[PDB]
């Protein structure tokens, strides 16, 4: 989960749709 950081970007669709942080 690197929705805060560790996804290849915080607009990846992971981190688009199960934010934390960004």
């Known amino acids: 989960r ?3 950081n ?4 915080c607009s990846s ?3 688009r749709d199960h934010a ?3």
């Open 2 to 4: 690197g929705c805060c």
């Open 6 to 9: 560790g996804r290849g970007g």
């Open 13 to 15: 669709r992971w981190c």
């Open 20 to 22: 934390r942080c960004c």
